[PDB]
Amino acid sequence: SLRCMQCKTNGDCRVEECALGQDLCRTTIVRLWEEGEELELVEKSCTHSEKTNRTLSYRTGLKITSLTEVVCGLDLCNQGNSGRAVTYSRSRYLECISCGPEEQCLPGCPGSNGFHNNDTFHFLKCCNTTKCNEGPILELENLPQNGRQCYSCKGNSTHGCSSEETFLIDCRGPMNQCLVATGTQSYMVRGCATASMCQHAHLFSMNHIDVSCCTKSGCNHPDLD
Amino acid sequence: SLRCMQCKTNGDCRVEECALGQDLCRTTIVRLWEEGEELELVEKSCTHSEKTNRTLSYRTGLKITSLTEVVCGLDLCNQGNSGRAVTYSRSRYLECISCGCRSPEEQCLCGYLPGCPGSNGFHNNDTFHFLKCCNTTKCNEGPILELENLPQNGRQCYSCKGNSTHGCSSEETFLIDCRGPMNQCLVATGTHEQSYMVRGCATASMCQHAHLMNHIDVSCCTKSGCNHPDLD
Ligand SMILES: *[C@@H]1O[C@H](CO)[C@@H](O)[C@H](O)[C@H]1NC(C)=O
Ligand SMILES: *[C@@H]1O[C@H](CO)[C@@H](O)[C@H](O)[C@H]1NC(C)=O
Ligand SMILES: *[C@@H]1O[C@H](CO)[C@@H](O)[C@H](O)[C@H]1NC(C)=O
Ligand SMILES: *[C@@H]1O[C@H](CO)[C@@H](O)[C@H](O)[C@H]1NC(C)=O
Ligand SMILES: *[C@@H]1O[C@H](CO)[C@@H](O)[C@H](O)[C@H]1NC(C)=O
Ligand SMILES: *[C@@H]1O[C@H](CO)[C@@H](O)[C@H](O)[C@H]1NC(C)=O
DSSP, X not given: OOEEEEEESSSOOEEEEOOTTOOEEEEEEXXXXXXXXXXXXXXXXXXXXXXXXXXXXXXXXXXXXXXXXXXXXXXXXXXXXXXXOOOOEEEEEOGGGGOOOOOOOOOOOSXXXXXXXXXXXXXXXXXXXXXXXXXXXXXXXXXXXXXXXXXXXXXXXXTBSSTTTOEEEEXXXXXXXXXXXXXXXXXXXXXXXXXXXXXXXXXXXXXXXXXEEEOSTTTTOGGGO | OOEEEEEETTSOOEEEEOOTTOOEEEEEEEEEEETTEEEEEEEEEEEOXXXXXXXXXXXXXXXXXXXXXXXXXXXXXXXXXXXXXXXXXXXXXXXXXXXXXXXXXXXXXXXXXXXXXXXXEEEOSSEEEEEEEESSHHHHSSOOOOGGGOOEEEEEEEEEESBTXXXXXXTTOEEEEEETTOOEEEEEEOBOOOBOOEEEEEOHHHHHSOOOOOSOEEEEEOSTXXXXXXXX
16 A cells, blocks of 8 residues: 655655555645745655645735834843743634635735834835835834934823923934824824825724824924824 | 844844944834735844945846646655655745846846746646746736646647657657646657656647756647657
C-alpha cells in the first residue's frame, strides 16, 4: 500500500500511508514574485487522481491596509499594561468567502485616510489597483512637515483634553487638516487629519463618532467648538 | 538613555536601552484584510521623533504567481532521491527595487518586456505548470486550481518528457486526455543544464508567449493527437 513523503516548510514532516483513493504522491512548488520579491514554496503530500469539485471564492477586488502607531517618551512605556500576554500576530479567515473591518457577504474605497496628533498615528488605505497595493505606508517618523499646525489631545474634557493638556503640534505628511472627534462616557481627540478622514472617519475608536475639520493652522483650538 | 520593549513575531523579544537620539518607545499595529482574510501584526521597538528620510520602491504593478505540481503512483516517489537535502521555501529580494536578460526574473534600470498579462497553463501525464500574470487586484483573488480539480476538456494529446532516446520515444509516448483550459496539444524541445523534449496538453496562451529548458522551441496545434512524434 502507498506511502508518500508528507512535508512542507514549518510543518510536521513524515512518511505517511495514504487514505484509500489517494493514489498519487505529490511535489508542489509555488513560486511567487511581487515587488522585487521572489517567494518559492515546496509542499510534498499524498493526493488523488479523481477529479473532485471545489467551491470558488468571492473575488472582492479590495485590499485594506490599516496602520496604527503609538509613541511615548517614558521608560518601558510600550510595554503592555495588561495582566495577560500580548498578541503579536493573528490570522483570521472569514469562511463565508469560501461558500458552501466590515462584514459584507454574498465603504468609501478606494483612497487613503490619515490622522495623527503628538503621539498616535492611524492610516488606512484601501485599494482596487495593484499599484496602490505596492506602495508602502509611511509611519510618523518619516513624514515631513507640511506647514500646518493643529491642536492635539485625547481624553475627557477634564482628563486628556483640557487647556493644560492640549498642545499645538506641527503636522506631517498629507495630514494638513485640523480635526476634532467626539464620541464615547464622553471622549475626544484633536490632531492633524487628511481631508479624506473628515468625510469618512474611522478611528479610542469610540461610537457616535462626531468629526469636524478646518483647513487653517490652529483652527481646531478648543474655544472654537 | 531610554529603555523600550523590542518585540515582534519571529523576533528576539526583550527590553533594551535604545540608541542615543531615539527618544520614543513605539507600538505598531498593522491590520491587513485581503481575500476574506484579516492579518494583524504588532511591533514594539525604539524610534525617534525627528523626521528622517526613507526611500520608496518602484511599484512594478505585477504579481507573478506560478504553480508547479508533479505526481507519481509509486511508494515514496515524491522523494527527491538526491544525496543532499531539499528546499521547502526560499525568499529572494532584488535590492535595486528599494532605490539602491530577466525572464521571468526582473531587470530594473533587458527590461519591462514580458508579454505577460494573463495566464499560461500546461500539463502532461504527470506534471502541471501554470503561470498567472497579474495587473489588477481581481486576477490575484483567483486561486490557481490543481489538476485534481480540472474536468476533461475533450482534447487528447501525446505526452512524454526527456531525451529523444530516453523519455520521449514512441515507446514512452502515451495519449492523455487534457483537463481545464489546456485544450491545445503541444511539443516543446529545449535543453537541460543535450537536446530536450516535452509534449503535453497546453493552453493557447502557453503556446503564444510562455516558458517555465534553454533555447526553447515550441509548436502547438489544436486537433487532438496532432502533437504526435512523427508529425514533426
Ligand atoms: C461538481 O461535482 C458534481 C459531483 O461531484 C458533478 O455532478 C458536477 O457536474 C460537478 N460540476 C462541475 C462544473 O464539474
Ligand atoms: C476601482 O473602483 C472604481 C470605482 O470607485 C472604478 O472606477 C475603477 O475602475 C476600479 N478600478 C479597478 C482597477 O478595478
Ligand atoms: C474621565 O473622568 C473620570 C472621572 O471624572 C476619571 O475617573 C477618568 O479617568 C477620566 N478619563 C480618563 C481617560 O482619564
Ligand atoms: C532627503 O534628505 C536630503 C538630504 O539628506 C534632502 O535634501 C532631501 O530633501 C530629503 N528628501 C526629500 C524627498 O526631500
Ligand atoms: C493593466 O495594464 C494594461 C496595459 O498593458 C492596461 O491597459 C490596464 O488598464 C492595466 N490595468 C490596471 C488595473 O492597471
Ligand atoms: C539520452 O538522454 C539520456 C539522459 O536522459 C542520456 O543518458 C543518453 O545517453 C541519451 N541518449 C543518447 C545520447 O543517445
